[PDB]
Design a protein around this ligand. Structure first.
Ligand SMILES: [Ca+2]
Lengths: 51, 51
């Protein structure tokens, strides 16, 4: 825990600076609104990315 | 030092995200090209802002 809290700091960055890239804004379900379907590695969508 | 390193993290943010607001780009000396004469609280120009 000597510098693990640091990651959590950076964690919040991601959402406040990138969460809108993975939001569910399309009503149809297909045709993503940001024109890119990739999930940035910063946003934790699966537990593996904790690594 | 339990979470003081955190500040240093945020410290680097400032420069990489705001240092250009306090750079010496004007050649004359008067006239700030960024139309801003204010100095961001993020950047440390004087030791007091360490607080
Ligand atoms: Ca300025």
């Amino acid at each position: 825990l000597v510098e693990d809290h640091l990651a959590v700091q950076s964690l919040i960055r991601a959402y406040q600076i990138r969460g809108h890239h993975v939001a569910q804004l399309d009503p149809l379900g297909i045709l993503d609104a940001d024109l890119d379907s990739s999930v940035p590695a910063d946003i934790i969508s699966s537990t593996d990315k904790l690594g």
